[PDB]
Structure 1
Amino acid sequence: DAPEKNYERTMAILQIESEKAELRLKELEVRRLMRAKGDGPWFQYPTIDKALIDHSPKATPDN
């Protein structure tokens, strides 16, 4: 093969792997911050839904 072909093939390979590595580091930091703060869509442990609440007037007023 031509030296130019190997040169530009290597540059394309290096760009792809650098992008993947930076994305992996971003994923790790995102996971840590999401677990610590809890506000993202991940690590959202479910709680009790509020459609199971009876809102009718009950038989005793003090409730």
Structure 2
Amino acid sequence: DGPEKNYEKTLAILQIESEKAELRLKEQEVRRLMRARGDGPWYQFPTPEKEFIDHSPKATPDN
């Protein structure tokens, strides 16, 4: 087919691989930041459930 086919295919491959490398580095940074200070979706460690707390009036008023 000629040299331009291989040339532009190589350009497309290089663009894909460079984008993948940048995405992997960004993913590493995102994971590190979330694990250090969990405020995104990931690394959300559990917490006791709020809905299982009694709020009805009880025997002792000092609650």
Shorter chain as denominator, the TM-score bin is: over 0.9
| Stretches (4+) displaced over 6 A | none
Q: Partner of 1:48 in structure 2?
A: 48
Normalized against structure 1, the TM-score is what? 0.95
d(CA) in 2 for partners of 1:13 and 1:41?
32
- Between the aligned residues of both structures, percent identity stands at 83
Output the CA distance in 1 between the equivalents of 2:40 and 2:14: 32
Q: Report the 3-state secondary structure (helix = DSSP H, G, I; strand = E; otherwise coil) of the residue aligned with 2:35.
A: helix
Q: Shift of the alpha carbon at 1:62?
A: 1.1
TM-fit CA distance, 1:61: 0.7
Number of aligned residue pairs: 63
For the aligned residue pairs, the C-alpha RMSD in angstroms reads 0.7
1:8 is matched with 8
Which consecutive residues of structure 1, in runs of 5 or more, have no partner in the other structure? none
Structure 2 residue runs of 5 or longer lacking an equivalent are none
Q: Which residue matches 1:33? A: 33
Mapped to 1, the partners of 2:35 and 2:5 lie a distance apart of 45
